[PDB]
Structures are given as structure tokens and as C-alpha cells.
Amino acid sequence: QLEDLRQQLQQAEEALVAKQELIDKLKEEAEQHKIVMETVPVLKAQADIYKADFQAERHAREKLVEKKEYLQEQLEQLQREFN
Amino acid sequence: MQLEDLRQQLQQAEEALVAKQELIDKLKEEAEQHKIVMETVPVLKAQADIYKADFQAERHAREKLVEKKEYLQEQLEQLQREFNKL
Amino acid sequence: RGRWACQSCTFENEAAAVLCSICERPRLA
Ligand SMILES: [Zn+2]
Questions:
Q1: Tell me, which fold does domain A1-83 have in CATH?
Q2: Chain A interface test: which of C1, C19, C21 (most A C-beta within 10 Å)
Q3: In three state form, how does the secondary structure of A8-71 look?
Q4: Which positions carry the signal peptide feature in this UniProt record (chain B)?
Q5: Chain C residues with CB inside 8 Å of B15's CB?
Q6: In angstroms, rounded to a whole number, what is the distance separating the alpha carbons of residues A44 and B43?
Q7: Residue contact A12–C18, C-beta within 8 A
Q8: A59-68: buried (b, 16+ CB within 10 Å) or exposed (e) per residue?
Q9: C5 Cα–ligand 1 center, Å
């Protein structure tokens, strides 16, 4: 009865230790994961800037194709009026 | 004496193991939360790369169109100057 | 004590066990 308890106590002591080492390992993982997660806002803002640069570029390019067409028609209509 | 005292120590240990498991459980839950955030990193990176390449295709095409627009503008301006004269 | 059934994985543990043999969770958790 008594040496059973003593040996149960000893297992509980080793289990305390093995749980605390798991906790310590989980804590140091959260540390390195915090670094990785702190890159995220920057990567988000990067994606945002390229998106904005791409959308402004596309829009400026579609405008310019329409202006080119427009100038070409004016060059031709100004010729007709020339003659 | 010895029996109830050992039993007291054991109960104390056993209750402390619950408090340890409780912290483990909370840490594992936060680690699930973290893993999801970290999993966006390659998506955000792929997304930036995509928009960067599309930006660069558009910038290249738009540059090639200013060149010909300015030339059309100059020819139109010069033709307008002749018609206004004569 | 008597054998005890882990409340998380349902494994029947020995009376002396302090952690569940299978999921390792403490007896009273
Ligand atoms: Zn279990």
C-alpha cells in the first residue's frame, strides 16, 4: 500500500517535469512563430501596393489606347477638312 | 501519519498536473490560431508576385504607347498649324 | 482507487496511473 503510493508519487513528479518541458517547448515555438507572423502585415501591404500599381497602370493603358485611336481619327478628319 | 501525508502530496501533484494540462491546452489552441496566420504567408507572397508581373506587363505596354501618342500629337499639332495658316 | 476511464479518449487506465496511457492527459483533467 505504502510503497505503491511512493511509486505513484514518483510518477507524478516525473509527469510534472515532462509536462513542464512540453510547456517550455510550446513557449519557444510561439516565440519563433511570433517572428514569422510579424512579417505578415508587410507582405499584405506589399501585395496591396502592387495591386494598386497594377490597377492604375491598366487604367492608364486603356485610356491611352482610346486617346491614340482618338488622335488618329482627328488627324484623318483634319485632312478631309484640309482638302 | 505517513499514509495520509503521502496521499496529500499525491493529490497536490495530481491537481498541479491539471493546471499544467490547462496551460498546455491553451498554448496548443494559440498554436492552431498561429499556424493559420502563418499559412497565409506563401499566399500573400504569391499574390504579390502575380500583381507585380501584371503591373510590369502593363507598364511595358503603356511605355510603348506614350511614344506613339506623342508622335500622333506632334503630327496633329503640325497639321493644325498649316490649316490655320492657309 | 480502482481503474479509471480517461474522460478525453475513453481508455481504461490502471488505478496507479497518473496520466492516461494513451493520450497522456492527467487523471483529474
Ligand atoms: Zn486518454
A1: 1.20.5
A2: C19
A3: HHHHHHHHHHHHHHHHHHHHHHHHHHHHHHHCHHHHHHHHHHHHHHHHHHHHHHHHHHHHHHHH
A4: none
A5: 28
A6: 10
A7: yes
A8: eebeebeeeb
A9: 8
Q: How far is C3 from chain B (nearest CA, A)?
A: 16
Q: Please give the CATH topology (third level) of the domain spanning B1-86.
A: 1.20.5
Domain that residue C4 falls in: 1-29
Resolution attained, angstroms:
2.0
Rounded to the nearest 5 degrees, what angle is found at the Cα of C19, between the Cα atoms of C15 and C23?
Answer: 120
Q: What technique was this entry resolved by? A: X-ray
Interface residue of A10, A11, A13 to substitute, partner C, most C CBs within 10 Å: A11
